[PDB]
Design a binder for this molecule. Structure first.
Ligand SMILES: Nc1ncnc2c1ncn2[C@@H]1O[C@H](COP(=O)(O)CP(=O)(O)OP(=O)(O)O)[C@@H](O)[C@H]1O
Ligand SMILES: [Cl-]
Ligand SMILES: [Mg+2]
Length: 158
C-alpha cells in the first residue's frame, strides 16, 4: 500500500529532527520510503512571533494495517519530539499525519483518512502535489482540482 504521510516541525532549527523522523519512517517494519518532497517553509499567519514550520510529504510503501502504521507514527512523535506546554497552536514539535492510505477510507475513533482537514491546508497539499500531482482521492476528488479550486499561496522551499 502506498501511504502518504505529512511531516511538520516547528523547531527553530528543524533539519536534524526532520531527518531523524525520516530515518525512523524508513525503519518502520514492512515499510520503506518511496519518495520525499522538498522541504517547505510555511508562515506564522497573523501573530508573527510564531516560528516558521518545516513541512514535507512522504510516500511510504507499507504492508502494515493502517492502525499499525498509526502506532508507529505516534511512537516516532513521542520519541523524536515533545509537546509544547504553550497552547493548541503548536501542539507538538514534530507532527506526523497520515494523509492518504492507498485508496482506503477510514473513519474510526483513532483514524480519519483521508486526513480530516488536509483539503484546508496548503502546507499539506502543496508538498503532496510535488510528489503526486496526479493523485485521486478515494471518493474521486483530485488533488489538482482542490488546489485549482482553492488557490492556496505557494510555499517557498526551506
Ligand atoms: N489521519 C490521521 N493521521 C494522524 N492522526 C490522526 C489521523 N486521523 C485521526 N488522527 C488522530 O488525531 C489525534 C490527534 O489530534 P490532535 O492532536 O487533537 C490535533 P493535531 O494532531 O495536534 O494536529 P492536526 O489536527 O492539525 O492534525 C490522534 O490521537 C489520532 O488518533
Ligand atoms: Cl486513503
Ligand atoms: Mg495530526
Amino acid at each position: 500500500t502506498v501511504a502518504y504521510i505529512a511531516i511538520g516541525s516547528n523547531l527553530a532549527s528543524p533539519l536534524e529532527q526532520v531527518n531523524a523522523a525520516l530515518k525512523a519512517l524508513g525503519d518502520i517494519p514492512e515499510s520503506h520510503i518511496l519518495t520525499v518532497s522538498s522541504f517547505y517553509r510555511t508562515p506564522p499567519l497573523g501573530p508573527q512571533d510564531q516560528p516558521d514550520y518545516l513541512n514535507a510529504a512522504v510516500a511510504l510503501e507499507t504492508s502494515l494495517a493502517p492502525e499499525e502504521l498509526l502506532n508507529h507514527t505516534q511512537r516516532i512523535e513521542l520519541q523524536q519530539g515533545r509537546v509544547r506546554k504553550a497552547e493548541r497552536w503548536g501542539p507538538r514539535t514534530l507532527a506526523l499525519d497520515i494523509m492518504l492510505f492507498g485508496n482506503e477510507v477510514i473513519n474510526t475513533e483513532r483514524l480519519t483518512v483521508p486526513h480530516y482537514d488536509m483539503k484546508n491546508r496548503g502546507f499539506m497539499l502543496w508538498p503532496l502535489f510535488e510528489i503526486a500531482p496526479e493523485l485521486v482521492f478515494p471518493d474521486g476528488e483530485m488533488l489538482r482540482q482542490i488546489l485549482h479550486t482553492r488557490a492556496f499561496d505557494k510555499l517557498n522551499k526551506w
